[PDB]
Amino acid sequence: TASWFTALTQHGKEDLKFPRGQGVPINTNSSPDDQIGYYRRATRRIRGGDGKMKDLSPRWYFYYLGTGPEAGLPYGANKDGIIWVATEGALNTPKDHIGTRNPANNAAIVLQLPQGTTLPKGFYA
Amino acid sequence: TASWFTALTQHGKEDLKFPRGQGVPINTNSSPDDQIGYYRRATRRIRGGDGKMKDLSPRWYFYYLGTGPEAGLPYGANKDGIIWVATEGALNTPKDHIGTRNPANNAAIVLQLPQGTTLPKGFYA
Amino acid sequence: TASWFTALTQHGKEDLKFPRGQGVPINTNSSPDDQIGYYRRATRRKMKDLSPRWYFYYLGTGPEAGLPYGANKDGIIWVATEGALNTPKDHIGTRNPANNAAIVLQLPQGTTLPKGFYA
Amino acid sequence: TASWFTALTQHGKEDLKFPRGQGVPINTNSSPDDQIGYYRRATRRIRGGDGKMKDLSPRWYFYYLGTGPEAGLPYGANKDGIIWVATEGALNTPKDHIGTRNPANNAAIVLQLPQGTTLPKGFYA
Numbered sequence: 211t212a213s214w215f216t217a218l219t220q221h222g223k224e225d226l227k228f229p230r231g232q233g234v235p236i237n238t239n240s241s242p243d244d245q246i247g248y249y250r251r252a253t254r255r256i257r258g259g260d261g262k263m264k265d266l267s268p269r270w271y272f273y274y275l276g277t278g279p280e281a282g283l284p285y286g287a288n289k290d291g292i293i294w295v296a297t298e299g300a301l302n303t304p305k306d307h308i309g310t311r312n313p314a315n316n317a318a319i320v321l322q323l324p325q326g327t328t329l330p331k332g333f334y335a
Numbered sequence: 336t337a338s339w340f341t342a343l344t345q346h347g348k349e350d351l352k353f354p355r356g357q358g359v360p361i362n363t364n365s366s367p368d369d370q371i372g373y374y375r376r377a378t379r380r381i382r383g384g385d386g387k388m389k390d391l392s393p394r395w396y397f398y399y400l401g402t403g404p405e406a407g408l409p410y411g412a413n414k415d416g417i418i419w420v421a422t423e424g425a426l427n428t429p430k431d432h433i434g435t436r437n438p439a440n441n442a443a444i445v446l447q448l449p450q451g452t453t454l455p456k457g458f459y460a
Numbered sequence: 461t462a463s464w465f466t467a468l469t470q471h472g473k474e475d476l477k478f479p480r481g482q483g484v485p486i487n488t489n490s491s492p493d494d495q496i497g498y499y500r501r502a503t504r505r506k507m508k509d510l511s512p513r514w515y516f517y518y519l520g521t522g523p524e525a526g527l528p529y530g531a532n533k534d535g536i537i538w539v540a541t542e543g544a545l546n547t548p549k550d551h552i553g554t555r556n557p558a559n560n561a562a563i564v565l566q567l568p569q570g571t572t573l574p575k576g577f578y579a
Numbered sequence: 580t581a582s583w584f585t586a587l588t589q590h591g592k593e594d595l596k597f598p599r600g601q602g603v604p605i606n607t608n609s610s611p612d613d614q615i616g617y618y619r620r621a622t623r624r625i626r627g628g629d630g631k632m633k634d635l636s637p638r639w640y641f642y643y644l645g646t647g648p649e650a651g652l653p654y655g656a657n658k659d660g661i662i663w664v665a666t667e668g669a670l671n672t673p674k675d676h677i678g679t680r681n682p683a684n685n686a687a688i689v690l691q692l693p694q695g696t697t698l699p700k701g702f703y704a
């Protein structure tokens with residue numbers, strides 16, 4: 211139960227957003243029907259080298275529709291820390307056949323977006 | 336016992352098939368002699384969104400000749416859920432020196448095929 | 461919790477130093493605002509006096525998290541890229557060796573290094 | 580305690596060898612003086628799922644002169660499973676300052692040789 215992909219890191223103050231049709235990570239081993247899901251914000255509060263509590267940049271992880279922590283949400287569900295992406299031609303059906311990644315069995319895929327798609331403002335990898 | 340590579344997912348009703356000479360996954364850590372093996376079908380059943388049991392898209396896993404669940408099958412042996420692939424120059428000898436992957440020690444390699452490889456409808460790489 | 465980057469090794473007698481605008485390690489997971497910090501000298505030891513290693517920390521992180529940019533102190537040198545903000549980089553912090561590997565320290569093509577430094 | 584670099588895998592029958600001046604892995608964070616060491620053969624015998632013993636391909640790991648399992652050997656020491664490499668200008672002095680890698684702290688560097696250099700016969704990565 212992990213994302214198939216590495217995270218997008220939020221350095222800026224804006225939540226992640228993509229224009230309609232953009233933001234689905236490249237996965238050559240998946241069908242055009244599969245190209246739909248959400249990014250989920252994950253936050254960390256950690257102790258620094260000075261021994262004080264610190265807020266790390268929020269990280270956003272991609273999950274295919276009907277997988278991951280919000281497997282039960284339908285496409286477009288309005289919820290804080292959840293944003294939706296879909297490529298033209300994707301089917302609005304759960305991607306049970308893809309599921310989530312077992313870190314014991316598989317490494318994360320480095321998240322890459324199609325040439326032309328730019329990371330939204332304040333996002334780095 | 337695991338495949339060195341991630342699966343090819345069967346999205347359509349066509350079984351995995353390659354023309355003679357095609358379908359061996361790219362692996363820079365292998366000789367021309369080594370480019371031969373089989374794909375093995377794995378199917379799984381889960382409870383769907385309706386709460387009814389359903390068959391997920393079959394997955395096909397590549398094993399080098401003389402390794403994996405069918406290590407004892409000779410090249411070309413007719414068995415359901417087994418298909419054979421070999422690159423030009425590959426030797427019909429067991430690939431003991433490559434063996435199979437231990438998930439505890441190694442992550443799967445992302446299965447890649449040469450650009451232009453013929454795949455049945457509903458297969459992507 | 462360690463440096464995000466591998467060390468610059470001092471092979472010569474010259475301490476690490478960079479002209480203003482140079483010396484911040486390349487990190488694609490950082491904004492132009494973030495391109496500021498210090499290198500800290502670490503030295504190790506029949507009896508051994510091994511080449512000093514200099515480790516990069518973002519401003520307001522690591523062993524000298526409490527020092528302001530430009531503080532004059534032995535074994536600490538300061539670097540900043542054009543456009544960097546003089547604010548602590550708490551959001552980046554330091555690396556947990558248990559969770560993350562060090563990034564190989566790389567400098568932009570053309571960066572000036574003292575004699576006995578290589579990157 | 581590990582090699583700084585990933586292994587070269589011996590698929591062929593020949594031991595590793597490089598022409599004089601070649602075979603030192605690229606390491607931009609080291610001096611011209613540092614460009615000298617040995618590769619050391621490591622072998623693995625494992626029992627397969629068929630209950631048969633399998634000799635996995637020998638792996639050759641690079642260590643800087645005066646580091647690693649043969650830290651005590653001088654440059655050119657004649658010993659089975661040890662082969663020597665040095666770049667023009669390297670100094671015949673122990674590289675104590677480099678030492679070996681702690682896998683807990685650092686990932687292996689992918690072993691790279693200068694563009695154009697081919698791996699010796701029977702070696703793959």
Ligand SMILES: [Zn+2]
Nearest residue numbers: 221490491494
């Ligand atoms: Zn930042």
Ligand SMILES: [Zn+2]
Nearest residue numbers: 240241244344
């Ligand atoms: Zn799919």
Ligand SMILES: [Zn+2]
Nearest residue numbers: 365366369590
């Ligand atoms: Zn081989």
Ligand SMILES: [Zn+2]
Nearest residue numbers: 469609610613
């Ligand atoms: Zn050195």
